[PDB]
Write a protein that binds this ligand. Sequence first.
Ligand SMILES: CC(=O)N[C@H]1[C@H]([C@H](O)[C@H](O)CO)O[C@@](O[C@H]2[C@@H](O)[C@@H](CO)O[C@@H](O[C@H]3[C@H](O)[C@@H](O)[C@H](O)O[C@@H]3CO)[C@@H]2O)(C(=O)O)C[C@@H]1O
Length: 239
Amino acid sequence: ESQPDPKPDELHKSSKFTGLMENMKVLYDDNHVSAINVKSIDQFLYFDLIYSIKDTKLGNYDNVRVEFKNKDLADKYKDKYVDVFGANYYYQCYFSKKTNDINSHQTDKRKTCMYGGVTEHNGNQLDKYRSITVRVFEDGKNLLSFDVQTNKKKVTAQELDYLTRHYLVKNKKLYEFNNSPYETGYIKFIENENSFWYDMMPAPGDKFDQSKYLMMYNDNKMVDSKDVKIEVYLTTKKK
Ligand SMILES: CC(=O)N[C@H]1[C@H]([C@H](O)[C@H](O)CO)O[C@@](O[C@H]2[C@@H](O)[C@@H](CO)O[C@@H](O[C@H]3[C@H](O)[C@@H](O)[C@H](O)O[C@@H]3CO)[C@@H]2O)(C(=O)O)C[C@@H]1O
């Protein structure tokens, strides 16, 4: 485990955020992007890829913009059958406008954006999900453990993160409309020597930036499902 742990004063305090926690809840509520064996159909900027992913429930989106850290990543998956899974946003999302004679555009009707969340489909599949155990701690005590599943040998930290946080919002009320019963909290993935963590709470302020928050996912960090272990440490809002 090496990525300097969070020192208690490092983490964001939910109390210090005074603006609709619902904007944070939604990214991890039931909805999300998920498609398997899709290939990019267009591009907007040199660091993104446009996918034809259909919102098979509420019909909210017809196309999806996956944005990356750099051209490399984008190039690595251009015209490659991949699986997609990630938390999407809309409010600050925009792309293409229409296939122009200048701008490399596409997309007719309903858009949504997301960062990373791409893995090769071909040869990264399992018949029989694998189980990653999540050990949540509350003020130091391992007072809960649940299983997250995946049929990918190489799974993105984003998928595991959404999976974990999704369960906590349901069962522990991690994120509520205007609040959170928690003061701090963070998710830590452990592979071997490797370990990194994400901050689950929004930065101080009267508002939250979905786009800027989700952007940390743009490195498309991957991990081995047969090696990870997830741990959440949540401190309680001084009751
Ligand atoms: C990759 C891609 O096709 N992107 C389209 C999407 C998808 O088709 C949509 O998300 C469905 O999953 O939306 C748009 O596609 C339509 C557009 O190209 C128009 C142009 O004339 O043709 C449509 O054909 C439809 C037709 O409208 C229906 O009445 C018919 O019953 O079925 C046809 C195919 O389903 C395209 O679907 C869109 O404008 O809605 C644009 C994106 O480029």
